[PDB]
Design an enzyme around this catalytic site. Structure first.
Site, mmCIF file in Angstrom:
data_model
loop_
_atom_site.group_PDB
_atom_site.id
_atom_site.type_symbol
_atom_site.label_atom_id
_atom_site.label_comp_id
_atom_site.label_asym_id
_atom_site.label_seq_id
_atom_site.Cartn_x
_atom_site.Cartn_y
_atom_site.Cartn_z
ATOM 1 N N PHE A 241 -25.368 -23.074 -8.909
ATOM 2 C CA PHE A 241 -25.437 -21.584 -8.622
ATOM 3 C C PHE A 241 -26.829 -21.210 -8.816
ATOM 4 O O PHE A 241 -27.275 -20.024 -9.478
ATOM 5 C CB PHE A 241 -24.560 -20.889 -9.535
ATOM 6 C CG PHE A 241 -23.156 -21.487 -9.143
ATOM 7 C CD1 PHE A 241 -22.481 -21.083 -8.035
ATOM 8 C CD2 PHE A 241 -22.419 -22.031 -10.163
ATOM 9 C CE1 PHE A 241 -21.303 -21.702 -7.987
ATOM 10 C CE2 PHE A 241 -21.158 -22.860 -9.956
ATOM 11 C CZ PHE A 241 -20.608 -22.457 -8.930
ATOM 12 N N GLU B 106 -23.399 -24.444 -14.472
ATOM 13 C CA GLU B 106 -24.044 -24.959 -13.226
ATOM 14 C C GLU B 106 -25.133 -23.882 -12.395
ATOM 15 O O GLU B 106 -25.202 -23.418 -11.453
ATOM 16 C CB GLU B 106 -23.093 -25.155 -11.973
ATOM 17 C CG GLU B 106 -22.426 -26.696 -12.010
ATOM 18 C CD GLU B 106 -23.451 -27.715 -11.613
ATOM 19 O OE1 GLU B 106 -22.989 -28.958 -11.348
ATOM 20 O OE2 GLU B 106 -24.728 -27.513 -11.807
ATOM 21 N N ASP B 107 -26.240 -23.815 -13.316
ATOM 22 C CA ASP B 107 -27.554 -23.049 -13.163
ATOM 23 C C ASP B 107 -27.133 -21.688 -12.783
ATOM 24 O O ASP B 107 -27.533 -21.212 -11.943
ATOM 25 C CB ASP B 107 -28.013 -23.538 -12.132
ATOM 26 C CG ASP B 107 -28.438 -25.024 -12.367
ATOM 27 O OD1 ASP B 107 -28.952 -25.697 -13.542
ATOM 28 O OD2 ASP B 107 -28.139 -26.064 -11.229
ATOM 29 N N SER B 108 -26.592 -20.904 -13.835
ATOM 30 C CA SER B 108 -26.196 -19.274 -13.875
ATOM 31 C C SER B 108 -26.420 -18.899 -15.052
ATOM 32 O O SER B 108 -26.558 -19.629 -16.017
ATOM 33 C CB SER B 108 -24.921 -19.180 -13.064
ATOM 34 O OG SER B 108 -24.374 -17.867 -12.801
#
Ligand SMILES: [Mg+2]
Ligand SMILES: [Zn+2]
Ligand SMILES: [Zn+2]
Ligand SMILES: [Zn+2]
Ligand SMILES: [Zn+2]
Lengths: 206, 404, 67, 1131, 46, 51, 115
Positions: free
Chosen positions: B41, D759-761
């Site tokens: 994301f 996940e990269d949020s």
């Protein structure tokens, strides 16, 4: 004519706290008011009209927000702390606007949040062990702790439950802190009362 | 709908989903279904295709739906598994000393879709009723599947001695009749490998039950992690003074060893080994010394870690990271290589103008004797940038050839 | 461009403190002592005053569109 | 006197600040352009030959002087007024100044009837001007003066304004010229090849490359050949030597082999002699050269003349192009052969193609000079034709009408406007990517774009060697800042103190060498070259010397005293091979360094004292350089330098490493560029993270420029509340990041909270966002013009009407005024009209051509500007303003490569809180740290907590031993916090403590240009392309998404045949054709009258309907265009 | 109907009709700006 | 072999722990733009008339 | 573009019920209370008050989606008791507790301002 666009000024005006102590209970939500867009029963009118004609920069501050209601005024304008700065104007720049203030709470927008920080704490000595410090000696003591300095945390209480909650409710200015707490208790109680009314209708309708 | 991410590498990059309309303007995905798409994301975008006939809709519903896509034919194993927060948290949750109170247990049971409404008898009745994390994951586990796995920290000499069936470390996962009888769940038990709980669930129970199993693990474990919490900070990157002294002694000994090999080579006291020239043999000896130093320092850092370390938590669960990452953050970053060799003499017989000519020492040729917490020196910084540039070039150049 | 009204984190009013903060700084206060004088005790509000860049003062160097 | 260590960190940074007070960040651009205007244009005009034209009377037309006035714009009236750059930006003008040339035409007919007519200031063209250069109206202006002109005082300049568009010239890498480079290609007929791209001092022709190669082993031995220019066949070196007048083998080897005691060189040259014995005289060798050439003259006379001209002009021009230079050319070609033999004998290393000492940076000046040479040559040509067609009639002509100034003007304007670097006709031989549109998204992006370098190796190339970070980039190029896409390692960025040399003439150096004990190359005997040291100047072997050491001492003293040798002159002494190479040419990247005495700096404390009062006693950087305390060292002279990383290296140690240093770093952090100099603690991150941040600082929102209120940029993002970082490096003081920052200090908690940051949020605080946290304003400018090109059709701004306009959409035009332009302050939604333009027809006599909003924007009109463009019709610019409040899907990043989109926003009561009710502005996932190893993120968070609690700005300068994690933790423990930055947080939903103490603190976050609202797109039966009736391409075109080949393969693997047919036939381009059942070719169908017939088969009954994609019908028709008969046989 | 514009350089309110070259009558400057509309645009202070 | 298609959408992806693995969370604007041609029958006559 | 109005978290849509009671069929004497336009503020207190009832066998709540604005409270009681009665008594007890807390806070404020 200022260097901040219109939405910047509007957003900035929305975040100015207005004294709401006795008036907020009397005013209605514009949802509930049977009037047109506005009326004095659900809203408060503000006017701002500033023009920088002189050579020094003119600080358009919250003192320039003139209200129709004397009870609802900017907190800093209330009769020390300086006035909130809305915009700086240069010679020839001008800002003239007309605002309306409404009743709301922090669920809708943080500008209706009356608190400038709510410190909340319980079990200052980690007796319930709801936290697990890998190195309890490394952690500073709470201001509410009752432990001698050699002792890092209280002995574990297996039969313990969270009691004795410590609060520090800081007010942004609109309400007095004790008015914030009293209004909070009343609002929570009315939420529960409305829930019980709807519950009774659902039970009896079955 | 078909939900797709580019590059569409295999058949799992386009799967069927059921639409759920939600407020804001992004495509919201489950977190297990991110590994099939290779999706994170950080600004990734995905393509939604809406089949426009009952025949195509039935086709996608009976062929390409995500639960039908759990096991891949490529390697006869699951393609999606439990992932970052849910994996670190299920590792922490199934530890032996996780005890849940009555209210916490009811909170977690609210998030089980496949719950029969019966509260299980707590593992501890007195002095105070307490359920265990394994006791709730047993409710999450579907059907009556049976599975044996081993936690990543399972010692290899435990299955031989006593305590094989009563593990001191709570390793050796054993699920029987759909109850987690014992063991700490991790990547090896809930990941995408063969014979894991998710695989055995898909093989014994259908794809629908496995879908619910994925969803229930995620919901229950995330709502428990709201209580437990997981973090990482400077304190996880720090080691004790004893560990730092051991690592510095290891590095000093390694640099003296490399100096000794250099002195031998300079005095012609070094003879080549079969199959290599003298330069290559000297390079092999130096690289062996420095790799030994890196591994020894990494072992020192790894043993220094506590059970509360969050790097160790994420590595143990397999959620993210590796022991080499911990070694580089705590102990030593190590040798930087360009094209599989030490830093080349890009100047005239020098790697940088800060070194003397003909300096085959470890620091001259790109050995970063600092950790990321210690911080790299300027020459270590440049050499590390060179080594990282090699990885960036590889990543950007392999794509065209592999796609062709 | 201009001092925010509230602290982004807590919502404490900082809009009325920029000018006082500058006046304290020219009064030979350290930034920490100045922030203590204004009553900014949480490091969020200290962040608000300490990291602010008054760009409006540079935007007021340009003559307006109308005289 | 000596600067002690305790003062060093101040002294060095004081020195660094002085540098940036003197030079700036775009000094290379300005100096390049200044040299081009002051020198290059005049040299190009004078180096052109006088055009002698005669039928009789004759005319020479000699150009003698140039004059470049200030930039000026002329109106229709003709009044003369200065053109300001902001007026050029607004009116879409070109910020150019007129170039006038003095011309001298003398009439010479007969009888000594001579008379000269001089045309002073003949307008020869218009040259675009780089902003803030010497010839810019903004030159020397104060900040008050720039603000009076609606210019930003922080604007660096260094770019051009062509048609209102800010264009920046990217420095182009190229192999250095006049230098012999011996390489060895593994797959080639030659074992070793020594090339020399030769180019005369004042460029007039391209680089003439000469190769001197050795044939790979397998007649008897290894033969040396020479690939001369304009000759398509290899030529033995001995033949070339004889063609230059050296016939005796002794003379040739005197020129090649300088030490006759060395039989190895001798036997390795012997095959070349043995191969050339039949040719033994100069004329025969010249005939051989002419015969091997691609234009073999039937008569040996013209062959010999052609060979003479080639060997005098095209062979090694840098050695000299005049006659009687055969001795110098012979010595140099012998040096090339000597270098090749040294490489083949293993006595010298092969040259490294990647060494930046072997490269040159082609900057704005030398690039504009290439353009100006081509364009002036074309202009003189056009003048020659024009004057010839008049003197052929035997009458005078007006040079003012001969000079069509559009050549130079339109050429420079086109080349800078498009980037295609070359003539407009040769639009495919021209090399694009030069002269890009200046990036104005944030101040860091502008600075980096102005300090951008380019390696034109070609992105298609998959060899990693030119993309690798070479060792020699140290201090010259940022190790981190590079694009991570297809141009890894090719597009580079200057390091902060990196200076590209502007160029200088070698005349004073050569004159001093003459007055000094150097011996010229024509006056010596070759026997002296053995023990002597060669001296090259700009690649030309000019002489030899006997004591190179004290020569180097003298020259270094001269350069450090600002004597005849200027500071940018490189002087390399190679000791093992006895060359001394001096370079004065342009494009040499170099950097300043502190000179070192025996073991001490020459920078004493008095220099720091005078630098501290820089603003009173006008003691500047140039006084530091003139004192002999600082020196500019280029990449090639760094090879001979022994650097000290810090003055601590100069201390006497228990075991001395060097003890003979010659220079010292001013500070190692200057190896980073503009965008990497913003990373705090970059030496605690994995290097890919630093590269990703260096790329992502350029998409960060901020205030890209102070005068953004007056700029009508196509796209612009301004952050409401930019903040300077609490944790900063000492390099941002010169990047002006403190005055134009591009982020906000956010209380970030690294925690697993609800799973919406995985996940990269990130999880953002809705209450903070309500308070203006990371709010921005998006400005979009629409341009329009009403063209009166001809009486056939004319456009005009006017409120359209439903009764006269034809192509009038159903959208309402009420927001427009009678002038046809919307007014400021009007709220405009998607598809709305902002400019009402109508064009006269040949719904009558006028059609609607109005400008709509780019769909799905919903802004407010910020302002409307009306003016006249260059030709002078009405021209409108409308800036619309849209407030972007951060939301789920917006991309945010820290300064450590930690990017992520907003997963969800929680209100302040829903976020986790500390005992003192502090909630995080952002929550990021702990799983983003371990694999990435961005420990700089954690150290910055901890330092920022200390800074906020202490009331200071943290020092995160990369290599600083006075700042480590233990000190920061000890400082933080003094403010009543856990020393490692952890805090007990409480669950916002339940209020219970979180078992794991969370790591929380201030970190500088950036909001990136990539907002989800500019990316979300959907389609359901929209517009289609004309050629193939398939969905359009793009959000802007309401296009469809591509179901590509890989999607087809995926669905084939799925076995979903109907879905595959739906995507590739029914959702893209369904179509029907009628096919003849006999010939299978598409028939003629008439469905209204129901008459179907194939003209081919002359049948009208056996026709069949076929449902095929339109693209397949188009394919089959394009095959029938190729005489292919694709017959769709239905049986 | 009047469409009064402001000068970019002299800031003078001057009326210009259609089909007229864009020129300020006070200083001849060629760049003009429209004045803020009189229409009523509303902002929620959020 | 590859072509542009109708009834497609594209936007940034975002985490959502509260969706099942087989669900996709879609914006209301994408869903309002994209349509599915449903055939009318006495089984769905009322619902489709409502829509 | 897709931002819901901020009042949608608090305000009921027309024809939308504040609370809905659905019998849970898995176990006897259990109910699901789906309460619209409320969040953890009321859910947590109602759950924790229900846990104080010894006749309540299960009391839990969940916000099924944070972007949605409803809560579900599951209550199971002993057979002689009812989940609706338990929920009613929990709300009554919370109201009485808050009334007492409000009166005592008023008294404490009066004491603090006076002395
Ligand atoms: Mg991604
Ligand atoms: Zn009202
Ligand atoms: Zn605050
Ligand atoms: Zn036919
Ligand atoms: Zn004017």
């Amino acid at each position: 004519s200022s260097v901040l666009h219109d939405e910047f000024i509007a957003h900035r005006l929305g975040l100015i706290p207005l004294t709401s102590d006795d008036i907020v209970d009397k005013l209605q939500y514009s949802r509930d008011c049977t009037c047109e867009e506005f009326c004095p029963e659900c809203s408060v009118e503000f006017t701002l009209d500033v023009r920088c004609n002189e050579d020094q920069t003119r600080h358009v501050t919250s003192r320039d927000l003139i209200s129709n209601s004397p009870r609802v005024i900017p907190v800093t304008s209330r009769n020390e702390q300086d006035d909130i700065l809305i915009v700086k104007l240069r010679k020839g720049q001008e800002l003239r606007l007309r605002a309306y203030a409404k009743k709301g709470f922090g669920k809708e927008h943080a500008k209706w949040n009356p608190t400038a920080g709510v410190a909340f704490e319980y079990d200052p000595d980690n007796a319930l062990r709801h936290t697990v410090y890998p190195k309890p000696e490394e952690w500073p003591k709470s201001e509410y702790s009752e432990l001698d300095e050699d002792e890092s945390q209280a002995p574990y209480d297996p039969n313990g439950k969270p009691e004795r909650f410590y609060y520090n409710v800081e007010s942004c200015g609109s309400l007095r802190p004790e008015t914030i707490v009293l209004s909070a208790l009343s609002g929570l109680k009315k939420k529960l009362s409305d829930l019980q009314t709807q519950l009774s209708h659902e039970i009896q309708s079955d | 709908v078909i939900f797709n991410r580019q590059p569409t590498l295999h058949k799992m990059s386009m799967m069927g989903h059921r639409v759920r309309i939600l407020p804001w303007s992004t495509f919201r995905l489950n977190l297990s279904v991110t590994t099939p798409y290779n999706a994170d994301f950080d600004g990734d975008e995905m393509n939604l295709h809406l089949p426009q006939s009952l025949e195509t809709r039935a086709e996608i519903q009976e062929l390409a739906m995500v639960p039908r896509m759990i096991v891949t034919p490529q390697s006869n194993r699951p393609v999606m598994g439990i992932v970052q927060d849910t994996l670190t948290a299920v590792r922490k949750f199934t530890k032996r000393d996780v005890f849940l109170e009555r209210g916490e247990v009811m909170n977690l049971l609210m998030f089980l879709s496949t719950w029969d409404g019966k509260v299980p008898q707590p593992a501890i009745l007195k002095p105070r009723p307490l359920w265990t994390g394994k006791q709730i994951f047993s409710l999450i586990i579907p059907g009556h599947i049976n599975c044996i796995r081993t936690h990543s920290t399972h010692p290899d000499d435990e299955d031989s001695g006593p305590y094989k069936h009563i593990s001191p470390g709570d390793t050796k996962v054993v699920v029987e009749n759909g109850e987690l009888i014992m063991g700490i769940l991790c990547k090896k038990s809930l990941g995408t490998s063969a014979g894991s709980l998710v695989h055995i669930s898909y093989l014994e129970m259908g794809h629908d039950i496995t879908r619910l199993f994925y969803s229930n693990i995620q919901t229950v474990i995330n709502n428990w992690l709201l209580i437990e919490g997981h973090t990482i900070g400077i304190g996880d990157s720090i080691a004790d003074s004893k560990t730092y002294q051991d690592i510095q002694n290891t590095i000093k000994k390694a640099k003296q060893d490399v100096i000794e090999v250099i002195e031998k080579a300079h005095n012609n006291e070094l003879e080549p080994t079969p199959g290599n020239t003298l330069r290559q043999t000297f390079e092999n000896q130096v690289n062996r010394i420095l790799n030994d130093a890196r591994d020894k320092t990494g072992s020192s850092a790894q043993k220094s870690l506590s059970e509360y370390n969050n790097f160790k938590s994420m590595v143990v669960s397999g959620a993210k990271g590796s022991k080499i990452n911990i070694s580089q953050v705590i102990a030593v970053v190590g040798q930087q290589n360009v094209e599989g060799k030490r830093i080349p003499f890009g100047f005239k017989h020098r790697t940088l103008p800060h070194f003397i000519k003909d300096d085959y020492g470890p620091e001259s040729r790109g050995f970063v004797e600092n950790s990321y917490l210690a911080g790299l020196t300027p020459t270590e910084f440049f050499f590390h940038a060179m080594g990282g540039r090699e990885g960036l070039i590889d990543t950007a150049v392999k794509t065209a050839e592999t796609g062709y | 461009m201009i001092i925010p009204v509230r602290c982004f984190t807590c919502g404490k009013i900082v809009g009325n403190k920029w000018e006082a903060y500058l006046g304290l700084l020219q009064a030979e206060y350290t930034e920490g002592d100045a922030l203590d004088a204004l009553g900014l005790k949480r490091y969020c509000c200290r962040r608000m005053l300490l990291a602010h860049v008054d760009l409006i003062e540079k935007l007021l160097n340009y003559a307006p569109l109308e005289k | 006197d000596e600067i002690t260590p305790d003062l060093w960190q101040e002294a060095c940074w004081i020195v660094i600040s002085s540098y940036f007070d003197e030079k700036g960040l775009v000094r290379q651009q300005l100096d390049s352009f200044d040299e081009f205007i002051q020198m290059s244009v005049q040299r190009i005009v004078e180096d052109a030959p006088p055009i002698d034209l005669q039928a009789p009377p004759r005319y020479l037309l000699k150009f003698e002087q140039i004059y470049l006035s200030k930039p000026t714009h002329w109106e229709r009236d003709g009044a003369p007024s200065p053109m300001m750059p902001n007026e050029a930006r607004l009116r879409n003008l070109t910020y150019s100044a007129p170039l006038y040339v003095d011309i001298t035409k003398t009439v010479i007919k007969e009888g000594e009837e001579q008379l000269q007519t001089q045309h002073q200031k003949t307008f020869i063209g218009k040259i675009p001007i780089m902003l803030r250069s010497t010839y810019c109206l903004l030159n020397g202006l104060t900040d008050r003066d720039l603000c009076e002109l609606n210019e930003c005082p922080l604007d660096p300049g260094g770019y051009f304004i062509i048609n209102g568009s800010e264009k920046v010239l990217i420095a182009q890498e190229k192999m250095a010229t006049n230098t012999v480079y011996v390489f060895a290609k593994k797959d080639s007929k030659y074992a070793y090849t020594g090339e020399c791209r030769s180019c005369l001092e004042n460029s007039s022709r391209p680089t003439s490359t000469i190769w001197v190669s050795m044939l790979a082993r397998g007649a008897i031995g290894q033969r040396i050949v020479a690939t001369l220019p304009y000759i398509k066949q290899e030529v033995p070196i001995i033949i070339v030597f004889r063609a230059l007048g050296f016939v005796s083998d002794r003379d040739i080897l005197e020129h090649i082999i300088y030490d006759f005691e060395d039989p190895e060189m001798m036997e390795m040259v012997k095959p070349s002699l043995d191969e050339a014995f039949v040719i033994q005289e100069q004329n025969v060798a010249l005939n051989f050269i002419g015969s091997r050439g691609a234009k073999p003259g039937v008569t040996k006379e013209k062959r010999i003349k052609y060979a003479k001209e080639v060997l005098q002009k095209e062979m090694l021009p840098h050695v000299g192009v005049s006659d009687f230079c055969e001795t110098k050319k012979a010595y140099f070609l012998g040096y090339m052969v000597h270098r090749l033999l040294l490489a083949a004998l293993g006595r010298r290393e092969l040259d490294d193609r990647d060494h930046y000492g072997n490269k040159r940076l082609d900057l704005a000046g030398p690039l504009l000079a290439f353009l100006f040479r081509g364009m002036f040559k074309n202009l003189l040509k056009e003048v020659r034709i024009y004057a010839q067609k008049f003197i052929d009639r035997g009458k005078d002509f007006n040079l003012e009408l001969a000079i069509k100034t559009r050549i130079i003007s339109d050429g420079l304007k086109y080349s800078l406007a498009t980037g295609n670097w070359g003539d407009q006709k040769k639009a495919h031989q021209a090399r694009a990517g030069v002269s890009q549109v200046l990036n104005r998204l944030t101040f860091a992006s502008t600075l980096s774009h102005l300090r951008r370098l380019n390696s034109p190796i070609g992105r298609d190339g998959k060899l990693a060697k030119p993309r690798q970070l070479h060792n020699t980039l140290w201090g010259m190029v940022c190790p981190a800042e590079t694009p991570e896409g297809h141009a890894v390692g090719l597009v580079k960025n200057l390091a902060l103190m990196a200076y590209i040399s502007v160029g200088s003439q070698p005349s004073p150096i050569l004159e001093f060498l003459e007055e000094w004990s150097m011996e010229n190359l024509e006056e010596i005997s070759p026997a002296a070259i053995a023990d002597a040291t060669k001296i090259f100047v700009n690649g030309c072997w000019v002489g030899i010397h006997k004591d190179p050491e004290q020569l180097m001492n003298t020259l270094r003293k001269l350069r450090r005293q600002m004597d005849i040798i200027v500071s940018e002159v490189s002087m390399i002494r190679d000791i093992r091979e006895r060359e001394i190479r001096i370079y004065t040419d342009a494009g040499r990247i170099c950097r300043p360094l502190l000179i070192v005495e025996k073991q001490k700096l020459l920078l004493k404390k008095r220099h720091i004292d005078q630098l501290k009062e820089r603003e009173y006693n006008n003691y500047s950087w140039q006084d530091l350089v003139a004192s002999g305390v600082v020196e500019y060292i280029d990449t090639l002279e760094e090879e001979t330098v022994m650097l000290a990383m810090t003055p601590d290296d100069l201390q006497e140690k228990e075991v001395a490493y060097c003890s003979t240093y010659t220079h010292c770093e001013i500070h190692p952090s200057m190896i980073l560029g503009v965008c990497a100099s913003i990373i705090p603690f970059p030496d605690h991150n994995q290097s890919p993270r630093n590269t990703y941040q260096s790329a992502m600082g350029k998409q960060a929102m901020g205030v890209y420029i102070t005068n953004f209120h007056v700029r009508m940029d196509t796209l612009a993002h301004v952050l409401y509340y930019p903040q300077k970082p609490l944790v900063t490096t000492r390099s941002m003081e010169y990047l002006r990041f403190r005055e134009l920052p591009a982020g906000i200090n956010s209380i970030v908690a690294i925690a697993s909270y609800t799973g919406y940051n995985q996940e990269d949020s990130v999880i953002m605080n809705r209450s903070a966002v309500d308070r203006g946290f990371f709010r921005s304003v998006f400005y979009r400018s629409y341009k329009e013009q009403e063209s009166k090109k001809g009486f056939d059709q004319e456009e005009v701004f006017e409120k359209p009407t439903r009764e006269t306009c034809q192509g009038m959409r159903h959208a309402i035009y009420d927001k427009l005024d009678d002038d046809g332009l919307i007014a400021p302050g009007v709220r405009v939604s998607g598809d709305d009209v902002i400019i009402g333009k109508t064009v006269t027809l040949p719904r009558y006599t006028k059609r609607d051509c109005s400008t709509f909003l780019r769909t799905s924007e919903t802004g407010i009109v910020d302002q409307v500007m009306v003016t006249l463009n260059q030709e002078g019709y009405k021209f409108c610019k409308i800036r619309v303003r849209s407030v972007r409040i951060p939301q789920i899907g917006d991309k945010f990043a820290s300064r450590h490569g930690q990017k992520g989109t907003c997963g969800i926003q929680y209100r302040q009561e829903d976020m986790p809180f500390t005992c003192e009710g502090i909630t995080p502005d952002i929550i990021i996932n702990p799983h983003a740290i371990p694999s990435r190893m961005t420990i700089g993120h954690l150290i910055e968070c901890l330092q920022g907590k200390v800074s906020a609690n202490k009331g200071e700005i943290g020092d995160a300068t990369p290599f600083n031993d006075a700042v480590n994690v233990q000190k920061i933790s000890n400082l933080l423990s003094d403010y009543g916090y856990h020393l490692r930055g952890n805090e007990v947080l409480y669950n916002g939903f339940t209020g219970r403590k979180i078992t794991s103490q969370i790591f929380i603190g201030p970190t500088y976050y950036q909001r990136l240009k990539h907002m989800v609202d500019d990316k979300i797109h959907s389609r359901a039966r929209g517009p289609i392309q004309i050629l193939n009736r398939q969905p359009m391409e793009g959000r802007s075109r309401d296009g469809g998404l591509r179901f590509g080949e890989m999607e087809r393969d995926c669905q084939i693997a799925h076995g979903a045949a109907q879905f595959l047919r739906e995507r590739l036939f029914e959702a893209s381009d369904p179509y029907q054709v009628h096919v003849c059942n006999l010939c299978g070719i598409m028939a003629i169908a008439n469905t209204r009258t129901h008459t179907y017939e194939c003209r081919g088969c002359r049948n009208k009954t056996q026709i069949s309907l076929v449902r095929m994609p339109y693209a397949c019908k188009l394919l089959f028709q394009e095959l029938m265009s190729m005489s292919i008969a694709p017959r769709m046989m239905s049986v | 109907q009047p469409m009064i514009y402001i000068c970019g350089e002299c800031h003078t309110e001057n009326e210009i009709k259609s089909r007229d070259p864009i020129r300020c009558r006070e200083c001849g400057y060629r760049i003009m700006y429209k004045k803020r509309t009189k229409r009523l645009v509303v902002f929620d202070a959020r | 072999m590859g072509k542009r298609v109708d009834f497609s959408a594209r936007t940034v992806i975002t985490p959502d722990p509260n969706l099942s693995i087989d669900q996709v969370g879609v914006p209301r604007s994408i869903a309002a733009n994209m349509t599915f041609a449903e055939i009318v029958t006495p089984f769905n006559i009322d619902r489709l008339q409502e829509l | 573009m897709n931002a819901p109005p901020a009042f949608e978290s608090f305000l009921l849509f027309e024809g939308e019920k504040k609370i809905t009671i659905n019998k849970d069929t898995k176990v006897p004497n259990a109910c699901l209370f789906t309460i619209n336009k409320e969040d953890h503020t009321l859910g947590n207190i109602i759950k924790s008050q229900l846990l104080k009832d010894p006749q309540v066998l299960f009391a839990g709540y969940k916000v099924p989606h944070p972007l949605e604005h409803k809560i579900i409270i599951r209550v199971q009681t002993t057979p002689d008791y009812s989940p609706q009665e338990a929920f009613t008594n929990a709300i009554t007890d919370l109201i009485s507790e808050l009334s007492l807390l409000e009166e005592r806070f008023r008294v404490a404020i009066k004491d603090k301002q006076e002395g």
